[PDB]
Amino acid sequence: KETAAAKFERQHMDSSTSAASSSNYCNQMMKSRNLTKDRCKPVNTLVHESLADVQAVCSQKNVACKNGQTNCYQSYSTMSITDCRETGSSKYPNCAYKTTQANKHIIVACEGNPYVPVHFDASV
């Protein structure tokens, strides 16, 4: 079984680029990060900053999570991110995603020792 921290890395980390290259970035990334294996993950955000920078958020602004839990943190600075969301023409096994690049604050849920990101809650 994949650890929560490892799952967060696979789903939400892409430090290899400064920002979404093209409109096909999401189709490519959602497939390579295995998020279209048995079904198309409807929504997924990828962060284009170093793993260290994202992990550091767990020691930044403590804020409420959408679900009410209090283990969420909002990055002090904005970060390059890409939101990947299924389009209307998307239908397994032919997943299709819209790529939306943005520079905003990220909010992640943290847990464990080390205290690292285990969920991507939202971006602001």
Side-chain angles (χ1 to χ4, degrees):
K1 183 186 178 186
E2 182 177 44
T3 67
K7 180 172 184 298
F8 175 96
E9 298 168 340
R10 175 173 62 81
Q11 293 190 137
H12 308 296
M13 292 300 307
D14 178 17
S15 317
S16 70
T17 309
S18 59
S21 304
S22 302
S23 56
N24 293 60
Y25 169 89
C26 285
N27 288 329
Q28 178 274 80
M29 289 301 295
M30 292 302 282
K31 178 181 177 300
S32 60
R33 293 308 180 81
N34 301 314
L35 300 181
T36 63
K37 285 292 187 178
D38 304 302
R39 180 181 180 63
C40 312
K41 186 170 189 287
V43 179
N44 191 65
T45 302
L46 284 154
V47 185
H48 312 309
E49 300 299 341
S50 67
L51 175 60
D53 279 7
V54 175
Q55 295 176 321
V57 178
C58 292
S59 294
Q60 296 175 194
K61 197 69 175 187
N62 183 44
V63 302
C65 301
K66 285 186 177 181
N67 67 184
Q69 291 182 293
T70 58
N71 64 316
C72 277
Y73 297 77
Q74 177 167 152
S75 63
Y76 295 145
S77 70
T78 60
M79 299 182 165
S80 173
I81 65 173
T82 299
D83 195 21
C84 294
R85 296 195 170 226
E86 277 187 285
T87 63
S89 66
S90 179
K91 183 177 299 302
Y92 185 72
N94 301 69
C95 307
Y97 293 90
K98 165 181 162 62
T99 300
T100 306
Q101 171 68 43
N103 292 77
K104 307 270 81 296
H105 304 84
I106 63 170
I107 298 180
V108 296
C110 303
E111 77 178 7
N113 183 180
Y115 197 58
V116 300
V118 294
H119 296 300
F120 187 94
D121 199 55
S123 78
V124 177

